[PDB]
Design an enzyme around this catalytic site. Structure first.
Site, PDB file in Angstrom:
ATOM      1  N   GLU A   1      13.580   1.407  -8.805  1.00 36.78           N
ATOM      2  CA  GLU A   1      12.497   1.883  -9.674  1.00 36.78           C
ATOM      3  C   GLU A   1      12.685   3.379  -9.922  1.00 36.78           C
ATOM      4  OE1 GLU A   1       8.454   1.358  -8.337  1.00 36.78           O
ATOM      5  OE2 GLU A   1       7.630   1.742 -10.367  1.00 36.78           O
TER       6      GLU A   1
ATOM      7  N   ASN B   1       9.864  -3.780  -3.222  1.00 32.97           N
ATOM      8  CA  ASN B   1      10.789  -4.812  -3.668  1.00 32.97           C
ATOM      9  C   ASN B   1      10.365  -6.139  -3.073  1.00 32.97           C
ATOM     10  OD1 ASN B   1      12.760  -2.559  -4.572  1.00 32.97           O
ATOM     11  ND2 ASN B   1      12.758  -2.338  -2.339  1.00 32.97           N
TER      12      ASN B   1
ATOM     13  N   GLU C   1       2.273  -0.908  -0.192  1.00 35.73           N
ATOM     14  CA  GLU C   1       3.436  -1.708  -0.581  1.00 35.73           C
ATOM     15  C   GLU C   1       3.132  -3.198  -0.516  1.00 35.73           C
ATOM     16  OE1 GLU C   1       5.664  -0.247  -2.034  1.00 35.73           O
ATOM     17  OE2 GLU C   1       5.061   1.801  -1.466  1.00 35.73           O
TER      18      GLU C   1
ATOM     19  N   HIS D   1       1.038  -4.269  -3.578  1.00 36.29           N
ATOM     20  CA  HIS D   1       1.849  -4.416  -4.786  1.00 36.29           C
ATOM     21  C   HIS D   1       2.366  -5.831  -4.978  1.00 36.29           C
ATOM     22  CE1 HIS D   1       2.366  -0.661  -6.872  1.00 36.29           C
ATOM     23  NE2 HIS D   1       2.909  -0.019  -5.858  1.00 36.29           N
TER      24      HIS D   1
HETATM   25  N1  LIG Z   1       6.331   1.818  -6.766  1.00 37.66           N
HETATM   26  C1  LIG Z   1       6.650   2.814  -5.712  1.00 37.66           C
HETATM   27  C2  LIG Z   1       7.130   4.084  -6.413  1.00 37.66           C
HETATM   28  C3  LIG Z   1       7.511   5.196  -5.437  1.00 37.66           C
HETATM   29  C4  LIG Z   1       6.338   6.072  -5.059  1.00 37.66           C
HETATM   30  C5  LIG Z   1       6.229   7.396  -5.471  1.00 37.66           C
HETATM   31 BR1  LIG Z   1       7.618   8.216  -6.463  1.00 37.66          BR
HETATM   32  C6  LIG Z   1       5.147   8.188  -5.132  1.00 37.66           C
HETATM   33  C7  LIG Z   1       4.163   7.685  -4.314  1.00 37.66           C
HETATM   34  C8  LIG Z   1       4.249   6.374  -3.836  1.00 37.66           C
HETATM   35  C9  LIG Z   1       3.176   5.897  -2.914  1.00 37.66           C
HETATM   36  C10 LIG Z   1       1.838   6.096  -3.226  1.00 37.66           C
HETATM   37  C11 LIG Z   1       0.836   5.687  -2.365  1.00 37.66           C
HETATM   38  C12 LIG Z   1       1.150   5.044  -1.206  1.00 37.66           C
HETATM   39  C13 LIG Z   1       2.467   4.885  -0.850  1.00 37.66           C
HETATM   40  C14 LIG Z   1       3.478   5.313  -1.692  1.00 37.66           C
HETATM   41  C15 LIG Z   1       5.321   5.565  -4.242  1.00 37.66           C
HETATM   42  C16 LIG Z   1       5.437   4.120  -3.795  1.00 37.66           C
HETATM   43  C17 LIG Z   1       5.346   3.024  -4.842  1.00 37.66           C
HETATM   44  O1  LIG Z   1       4.321   3.270  -5.747  1.00 37.66           O
HETATM   45  O2  LIG Z   1       5.056   1.794  -4.216  1.00 37.66           O
HETATM   46 ZN   LIG Z   2       2.815   2.021  -5.726  1.00 43.59          ZN
END
Ligand SMILES: [NH3+][C@H]1CCc2c(Br)ccc(-c3ccccc3)c2CC1(O)O
Ligand SMILES: [Zn+2]
Ligand SMILES: [Cl-]
Ligand SMILES: [Cl-]
Ligand code: NA
Ligand code: NA
Ligand code: NA
Ligand code: NA
Ligand code: NA
Ligand code: NA
Length: 868
Positions: free
Chosen positions: A119, A263, A296, A299
């Site tokens: 990503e 993922n 995670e 998601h």
């Molecule tokens: N889709 C990924 C992208 C990578 C990313 C970034 Br770049 C910035 C902050 C976070 C995140 C924000 C809050 C909790 C935990 C992680 C993430 C994790 C994600 O969003 O799951």
């Molecule tokens: Zn996220």
């Protein structure tokens, strides 16, 4: 040569879909060979070519239905294949080099392991593909590798085949039945210790849980495993959602740019959000592991089962998943402390972004480099927008909306608008006006005036809104602002809200530029609580008296309001004393302000979790947002002077509460965490007591601590107050912990944020420290990022030395790791918030970066906006 901006309004459905992809990786650190067999279907015009994205690939061959193809061309970033049937099998073989991948995008090395980050647009660094999230394919992944070096070969889904080969190689094949966009692909190869457990879903599905960590780290994994089970249970209880596969894998890696990544069935985490033991990890680390594990996990539905049509829709999954992680943390732990800290982030960091050259709506309209849009706005303001929907709908309706969203969009790549329409349709609440929150950038300013009429016993609020123009948008319009209130009589009792004989909802719909709200049967003059629980992400302008605010600190029903009133009370005197500093005058603070904080210390009925936050002064970044022009030296020095004044005035009470909250047992339990936060909030002030008394108290806490929370709190105090024991304690920590990178990150942050006059010299020298390396994003962020972002007084030294230091570091990182470079340039982008002499030096710095050979698109986008 720089890439052109892409626009949300240019979205077009893909000319081709890929329904199924069979990948083979012949893995090696120097050379990996990828074979990708894709089943493609044309949807667009019969003469349209197939345009595949690819970056830094060595193409070996192209076949269509096993025929070597001649009708193709490589172009910048692409492989264009012409003259295709309507349905066909595409086979691409190409080579990549993980060991050369210092950007940590695609397939790369983390120590001795190989792992991926796809990503937003990393899969095109692995093979030529339709690397766009509205292309959803069923993946099968075969991994071939040296067995000794890579005994564990992981990808998404379930193991469906395995074998052994000559010359010490072996292979495993994985199948993930859920169609996915390629940004959710993952591959991991390496040698790991594995913590294995089970979660049984409420309908009886047994899920195998597997946490992969480096050898020797098993005893640092149980809290993350516990947190995963807690996340699974909560999503069942709160959202009615069960996990949908058989295995759940998490891999902890030391080299990772993006925190953690969802993922499908194979999450990859920065080790900082997995590993914990009580001697090395703080309470905050434990609760961050909980929230990132949760994020995670959440998601899996809000991002994976329903994904994003295009990357301008990122907040569709991120605002909603942040909202979910906040609700998880808040339900399990202290809701008030969670809300308070999320509001601190909003007011102290996100508001700054929304006024900056990088301002964007939570649904952007224009993007050059998508990895630049994983922002405070998309995430944190995104979550505030979800929470406003929750406020307007209530939990029951909100969950009905979630249910309709999944029913309609499960298995698809949806839009922000789709989500709003599901909420609107399920609830019958009109969200047409509300949708402007997705398209308008900037922070609204809500101005409130009130009037109490004793003749009619009516209380009237006159409420105005405006959003100042931002660099990205010259036109602004009024928003649908949910504006929550509560009214208090002289005894602190809530006054019922009513008008004309009918109750009135406490969430006022502020939808116009100006409007009035009239409340009757208000028998005595009220004290209002306004914007309760930060009910919309706005700046509030109301002319509080000090008395009204200390009244709310004593009487407001929601803990958040008590904290928020204390913030408003402080704001006045922070502004007062910054103006005084600029004229060479010392801190001035009315007695009755100190007395409000004295009363918080001595109030036995206040939750210690709340008292601790009231006794935690706004950060220098929160303070900056109070000012039109930021004076970072004045802000820093006033914050210290305020700390010292409160330390002196409250010395006896601070010590009494410090002692009263001593805990001999250490537990990661919310009541214990709260008592510790209160004790250590007192410690911050006590560190500024008489120098020797403070020195003894701080060094004793450091040396007697039976956990890292208390040790780090003492170390931080020794640095903050420049106590005699500081150098000895800092050296003791280094000698004890230098081989532990996560622990040394805390020490680098303390070095970088030190008030010492020689901080930059120390930071520069630490580029050679045994625990530091430019190859590791955590080390970079803890030393360099903390200096530039969290020590604005030193970063903004009037000689310009902080800017020159950051230019040196960015000159390296632009080439090495542009994503980390782009996070680190953000402090320079804010130059128009500073005085003219500083602006000139910051512009000169940015113009130097603008002229770099091989300037990354990541930096180009931000530099261009900043220099406009
Ligand atoms: N889709 C990924 C992208 C990578 C990313 C970034 Br770049 C910035 C902050 C976070 C995140 C924000 C809050 C909790 C935990 C992680 C993430 C994790 C994600 O969003 O799951
Ligand atoms: Zn996220
Ligand atoms: Cl190799
Ligand atoms: Cl690890
Ligand atoms: Na709770
Ligand atoms: Na890009
Ligand atoms: Na309804
Ligand atoms: Na008035
Ligand atoms: Na209410
Ligand atoms: Na080093």
């Amino acid at each position: 040569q720089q890439p052109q901006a892409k626009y949300r309004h240019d979205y077009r459905a893909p000319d081709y879909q890929i329904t199924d992809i069979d990948l083979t990786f012949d893995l090696d650190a120097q050379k990996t060979v990828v074979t990708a067999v894709s089943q493609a279907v044309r949807h667009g015009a019969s003469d349209a070519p197939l345009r595949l994205n690819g970056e830094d690939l060595k193409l070996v061959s192209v076949h269509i239905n096993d025929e070597p193809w001649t009708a193709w061309k490589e172009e910048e970033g692409a492989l264009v294949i012409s003259n295709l049937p309507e349905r066909f099998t595409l086979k691409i073989i190409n080579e990549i080099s993980p060991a050369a991948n210092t950007a940590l995008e695609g397939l790369y090395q983390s120590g001795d392991a190989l792992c991926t980050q796809c990503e937003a647009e990393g899969f095109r660094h692995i093979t030529y593909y339709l690397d766009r999230p509205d292309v959803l394919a069923r993946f099968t992944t075969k991994i071939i590798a040296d067995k000794i070096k890579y005994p564990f070969l992981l990808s998404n889904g379930n193991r469906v085949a395995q074998g052994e080969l000559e010359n010490g190689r072996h292979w495993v094949q994985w199948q993930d039945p859920f169609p996915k966009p390629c940004y959710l692909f993952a591959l991991v190869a390496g040698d790991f210790d594995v913590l294995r457990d089970t979660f049984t879903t409420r309908s009886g599905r047994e899920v195998a849980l597997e946490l992969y960590v480096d050898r020797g780290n098993l005893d640092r994994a149980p809290w993350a495993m516990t947190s995963l089970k807690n996340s699974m249970k909560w999503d069942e209880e709160r959202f009615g959602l069960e996990y949908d596969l058989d295995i759940y894998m998490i891999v902890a890696v030391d080299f990772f740019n993006m925190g953690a990544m969802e993922n499908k069935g194979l999450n990859i985490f920065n080790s900082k959000y997995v590993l914990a033991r009580t001697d090395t990890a703080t309470d905050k680390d434990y609760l961050d592991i909980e929230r990132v594990i949760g994020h995670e996990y959440f998601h899996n539905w809000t991002g994976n089962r329903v994904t994003c049509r295009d990357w301008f829709q990122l907040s569709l999954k991120e605002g909603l998943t942040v909202f979910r992680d906040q609700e998880f943390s808040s339900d399990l732990g202290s809701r008030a402390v969670n809300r308070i800290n999320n509001v601190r982030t909003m007011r102290g960091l996100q508001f700054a972004e929304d006024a900056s050259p990088m301002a964007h709506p939570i649904r952007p309209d224009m993007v050059i480099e998508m990895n630049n849009f994983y922002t405070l706005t998309v995430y944190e303001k995104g979550a505030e927008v979800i929470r406003m929907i929750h406020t307007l709908l209530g939990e029951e309706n909100f969950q009905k909306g979630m249910q309709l969203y999944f029913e309609r969009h499960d298995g698809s790549a949806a839009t922000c608008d789709d989500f709003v329409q599901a909420m609107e349709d399920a609830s019958n609440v009109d969200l047409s006006h509300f949708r402007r929150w997705y398209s308008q950038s900037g922070t609204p300013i809500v101005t409130v005036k009130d009037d109490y009429n004793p003749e009619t016993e009516q209380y009237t609020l006159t409420i105005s809104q405006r959003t100042p123009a931002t660099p990205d948008q010259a036109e602004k319009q009024p928003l649908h602002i949910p504006f929550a209130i509560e009214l208090y009589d002289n005894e602190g009792k809530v006054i019922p809200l009513q008008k004309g004989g009918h109750p009135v909802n406490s969430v006022l719909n502020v939808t116009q530029a100006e409007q009035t709200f009239v409340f009757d049967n208000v028998y005595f003059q009220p004290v209002p609580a306004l914007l309760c629980e930060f009910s919309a992400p706005v700046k509030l302008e109301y002319k509080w008296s000090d008395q009204q605010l200390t009244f709310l600190m004593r009487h407001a029903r929601n803990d958040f309001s008590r904290w928020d009133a204390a913030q408003s009370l402080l704001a006045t005197y922070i502004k007062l004393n910054v103006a005084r500093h600029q004229q060479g005058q010392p801190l001035s603070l009315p007695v009755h302000v100190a007395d409000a904080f004295r009363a918080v210390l001595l109030d036995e009925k206040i939750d210690p979790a709340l008292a601790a936050e009231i006794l935690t002064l706004p950060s220098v970044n929160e303070m900056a947002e109070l000012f039109d022009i930021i004076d970072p030296i004045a802000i820093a020095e006033v914050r210290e002077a305020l700390t010292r004044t409160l330390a002196t005035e409250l010395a006896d009470e601070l010590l009494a509460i410090y002692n009263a909250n001593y805990q001999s047992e250490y537990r990661v339990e919310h009541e214990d965490i709260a008592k510790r936060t209160l004790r250590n909030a007192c410690l911050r002030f006590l560190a500024f007591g008489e120098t020797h008394l403070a020195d003894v108290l701080v060094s004793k806490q450091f040396h007697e601590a039976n956990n890292m929370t208390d040790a780090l709190a003492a170390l931080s105090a020794a640095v903050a107050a420049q106590l005699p024991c500081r150098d000895a304690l800092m050296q003791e920590y280094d000698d004890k912990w230098h081989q532990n990178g996560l622990v040394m990150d805390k020490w680098f942050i303390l070095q970088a944020t030190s008030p010492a006059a020689n901080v930059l010299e120390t930071v520069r020298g630490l580029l050679q420290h045994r625990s530091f390396t430019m190859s590791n994003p955590n080390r970079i962020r803890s030393l360099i990022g903390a200096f530039a972002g969290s020590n604005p007084a030193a970063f903004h030294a009037e000689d310009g030395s902080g800017y020159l230091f950051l230019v040196e570091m960015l000159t390296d990182l632009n080439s090495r790791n542009p994503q980390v470079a782009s996070r680190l340039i953000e402090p320079l982008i804010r130059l128009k918030r500073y005085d003219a002499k500083r602006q000139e030096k910051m512009r000169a710095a940015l113009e130097q970066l603008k002229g770099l050979e091989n300037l990354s698109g990541d930096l180009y986008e931000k530099i261009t906006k900043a220099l406009a």
